[PDB]
Every structure is written in structure tokens, then in C-alpha cells.
Amino acid sequence: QIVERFGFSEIMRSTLEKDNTVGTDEALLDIYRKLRPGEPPTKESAQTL
Amino acid sequence: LYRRVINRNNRLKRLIDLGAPEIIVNNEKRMLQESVDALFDNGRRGRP
Amino acid sequence: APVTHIWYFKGVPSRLGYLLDLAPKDLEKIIYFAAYVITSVDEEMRHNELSTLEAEMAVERKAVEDQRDGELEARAQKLEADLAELEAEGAKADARRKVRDGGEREMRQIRDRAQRELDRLEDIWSTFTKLAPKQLIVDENLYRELVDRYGEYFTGAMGAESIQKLIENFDIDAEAESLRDVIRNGKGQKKLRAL
Amino acid sequence: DESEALRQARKDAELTASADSVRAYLKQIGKVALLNAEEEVELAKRIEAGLYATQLMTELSERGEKLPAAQRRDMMWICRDGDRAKNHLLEANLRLVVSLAKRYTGRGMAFLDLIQEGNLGLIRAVEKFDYTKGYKFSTYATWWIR
DNA sequence: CATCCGTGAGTC
DNA sequence: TATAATGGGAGCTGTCACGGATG
């Protein structure tokens, strides 16, 4: 769906490609890890905030 | 600021003498450190 | 309990941090009780027992490995046995694939759980081997394991007073000349920080 | 389900210490596990024995005479284990203080100074605790911390 | 040569 | 002062130009 909605541009295609990790779990964990370091990352504690 | 240090300094004394766990005693020491720091230079480290 | 003058700590450049050759971010984690710091270590006593201590640690790694290789075997036995028990029942071969992948998942966890133990025992031995003053042990469970095992061999403290001790055992004259030798070396970036 | 990534990413976060002095203390408490009702009873039993072996030697030291090398050492170990059990009970219900010290916030006294003074009451609470009554530790504690 | 933190930014 | 009670809570928002430590 990322390719569908934002595909009309090359700068978004260049972004999804340079994207480090894939996965719904891995994305939430990644954002959580950068937002609040120092706290145990559950798949349920990253979904919540 | 003086009142904050002496309060926490004299709480450290009670905690030390009561043979309190390291988790509580360390917590006091830290607060004391921030207490004395806040007196010397406020807002330098952390929120004022 | 002692407490550090904030002027000589947070003021940039950090005077204490320059004095003990301690990182500004590392100096924080010590004074404000977030990471332990090694104050002194009996380097001779470590050496005199180093051989004996190596052997002891070595037995543990094996005793951990031996249970792993044994525990894995028992599961491999029951995986093969259950896959044949669901064969005598005459289940669909595909329904055996679920059971097959289940076991391979279990064994993976067993191998990993033991691997983390080995890696813990590895990082423990490494840390004790290369233990010296001014080191920061930020992981607490390591330091606890480090104390219960080799507490006789080093002096570990935390907080402002730990920094006080560092200043006491500080050799000004020695650290001075040592820095002058780095100045005598041409290399710029390391001469900069030594200047 | 449990990926190797999360297992590494969990120890990465927990190891790093936050800048907030309030947050850092909250992080520390969460390590110790909450106590079962009967697990509390065990510690209570231990402290009693420990607190009692202490009262013995205290008055004996003043009067002079001391136990043999086998009795005193055996007596002494209870005193350590007793003093150790006390610290374990204080660490477990250490959350309890923080639970009802947050309510007195903004009254001219800092949060940390409240939690500490609360902990200070928890310490006295663990000494006068009695396990003969079928009451959990949490109730006799609360009245002491407030 | 360009970022990140700390310290400046008229008087009555 | 014995029912049982167990990990916070507001953030603050529109600078500016610079040196020094880090890249």
C-alpha cells in the first residue's frame, strides 16, 4: 500500500527502498526504541503509546 | 535550597543508620547530589 | 556522603572528566548512580590465581554445554518417537509436518537459551580478565555476578564518593608526564586531546 | 514469536539509563517481583528469627559472656539471613510506597522527598509486621506509609 | 567546512 | 497503626549568532 499511495513520486520510492527494516512488529519496536530508551520493549507496550 | 539539602542530608543519616537496602540509600544520595547541585548552580544539569 | 561540585563536572569542558580521563557521558552515569565504576584491582592476585580461575570458569561452560547437548538429544528422541506415534495412528502426513516444525522450534529455543548463558559466562570472564580502574560496568546483573564470583579481586563502588576515591589514587605527576609523551608524538588528534 | 531481535533490543533499552531522576528510580523498583501472599509469610518468618537472634546477642554483649564457636556462628547466620529477608521485603513492596506517594504531589514537597519519607515509614512497617494474623502485608503497610 | 550545547543579546 | 491496596505526569512550543567538541 506504500507503493500504491505514494508511488507517483520517486522520492518515496527512494525512501521505502532505503528503509532499514520491514515488519509491523519491527517498526513499532524501532520507534519505541528511539522514543523512550531505558524501558523494556513489549510488542504490546509499543503498540499502546 | 539550603533547606532542601539539609532535609535530604538528614534523611540519608536516618536511612544509613536504619541499615536500609542499597536501592533506597542510593536513591537518597542521588537526590542529595542533585540537591547540592541545585543550590550551587540551578538548571545547569536537568530541569531547574 | 560526599558530593561533587557541579561546577567542575557539567561545566564544559568537564574538568573532572579531563582529569581522570573519563568521558563526560560516563562521568554522569557514575556520580548520579546509574552505573558502577571500578576503583581498584589487585592485579597481582588475579595473575597468581588466573590459571586456577580459568579452569573453574571452563568447567561451568562445559557443564552448561553438556546439559544442552543432552537435553537436545532427549527432545530429538521424542520428536522422532511422536512423529512415529502419529504415524501409527494414521494421521495425515501434513498433520505430522506441524508436529515436525514444532519440535524444530523447541530445539531452537533450547539451543538459544543455553547460548545466552554461554554468552553471559563469556562476557563475565572477559570483563574480569580485562578489569582495571576507571572502567564502567553499566549492566548491574553482570556486576553482581562479577562480585559474587571475583569480589576478592577488585574494589567496586558507585556514586560521588567513588569518584572521590579515584582522585585519591590519582597520580598527578605520572599522568602529567604520560600526557607529555603523547604531546611528543606527532599524531594531531590524540595530541589535541592530550594538550 | 520471540525473535532474536527483540531479545537483543530488550537488553539494549533496559541497560541504558534515562536522564530523568524520577524515571530512573521507577526503573529500578520494577526489577524486583511482586510478592505472593504466602511468600510474604516466609519472609516474615525469617525476619522474626533474624530479629530475635539479634536481641539475644545484644544483651549478652553487655553482660559479657558469649556463645561457643558453633552456636554463635549458627546464631550469627540467622542474623544475616534475617537482615537479608528484611531487605527483600522492603524491595518487593517498594512499589507500594510509590503508589500512594504520588497523590500527595504538589503540596510544597517534591515527589522524591515524598517517596523517600514513605519508604522511611515502610521500613518501620516491616519491623512491626506480624504474620500470625491472616492479613496480607499490603494492608498493615499502607497505614504506616500514609 | 558543517552539527549539538551553552551563553550571550542598550540605558534610565 | 492490621480488609486489601504494589512502575509519574506535564510537557510547550515563533529566535539569534557564535565557539568548541564531534562528524
Curated annotation (Swiss-Prot), chain A:
The RNAP catalytic core consists of 2 alpha, 1 beta, 1 beta' and 1 omega subunit. When a sigma factor is associated with the core the holoenzyme is formed, which can initiate transcription. Interacts with CarD, TRCF (Mfd) and RbpA. Belongs to the RNA polymerase beta chain family. DNA-dependent RNA polymerase catalyzes the transcription of DNA into RNA using the four ribonucleoside triphosphates as substrates. This is DNA-directed RNA polymerase subunit beta. It comes from Mycobacterium tuberculosis (strain ATCC 25618 / H37Rv). The chain holds residues 247 to 295 of 1178 of the full protein.
UniProtKB/Swiss-Prot annotation, chain B:
It comes from the Bacteria. Transmembrane segments: none annotated. Induction: 6-fold repressed by starvation. Belongs to the RNA polymerase beta' chain family. DNA-dependent RNA polymerase catalyzes the transcription of DNA into RNA using the four ribonucleoside triphosphates as substrates. The RNAP catalytic core consists of 2 alpha, 1 beta, 1 beta' and 1 omega subunit. When a sigma factor is associated with the core the holoenzyme is formed, which can initiate transcription. This is DNA-directed RNA polymerase subunit beta'. It comes from Mycobacterium tuberculosis (strain ATCC 25618 / H37Rv).
Swiss-Prot record, chain D:
Residues 19-53 are annotated as: Sigma-70 factor domain-1. Interacts transiently with the RNA polymerase catalytic core formed by RpoA, RpoB, RpoC and RpoZ (2 alpha, 1 beta, 1 beta' and 1 omega subunit) to form the RNA polymerase holoenzyme that can initiate transcription. Interacts with WhiB3 and probably with RbpA probably via its sigma-2 region. One of its GO terms (biological process) is DNA-templated transcription initiation. Keywords: Cytoplasm, DNA-binding, Sigma factor, Transcription, Transcription regulation. It comes from Mycobacterium tuberculosis (strain ATCC 25618 / H37Rv). This is RNA polymerase sigma factor SigA. Sigma factors are initiation factors that promote the attachment of RNA polymerase to specific initiation sites and are then released. This sigma factor is the primary sigma factor during exponential growth. Belongs to the sigma-70 factor family. RpoD/SigA subfamily. The sigma-70 factor domain-2 mediates sequence-specific interaction with the -10 element in promoter DNA, and plays an important role in melting the double-stranded DNA and the formation of the transcription bubble. The sigma-70 factor domain-2 mediates interaction with the RNA polymerase subunits RpoB and RpoC. The sigma-70 factor domain-4 contains a helix-turn-helix (H-T-H) motif that mediates interaction with the -35 element in promoter DNA. The domain also mediates interaction with the RNA polymerase subunit RpoA. Was identified as a high-confidence drug target. A motif (Interaction with polymerase core subunit RpoC) lies at residues 113-116. It is found in: Cytoplasm. GO terms for molecular function: DNA binding; sigma factor activity. Induction: Constitutively expressed under all conditions tested except for 3-fold reduction in stationary phase, standing culture and upon growth in H(2)O. 2-fold induced by starvation. Half-life of over 40 minutes. The lineage of its organism: Bacteria, Bacillati, Actinomycetota, Actinomycetes, Mycobacteriales. Residues 89-146 are annotated as: Sigma-70 factor domain-2. The keyword RNA-binding does not apply.
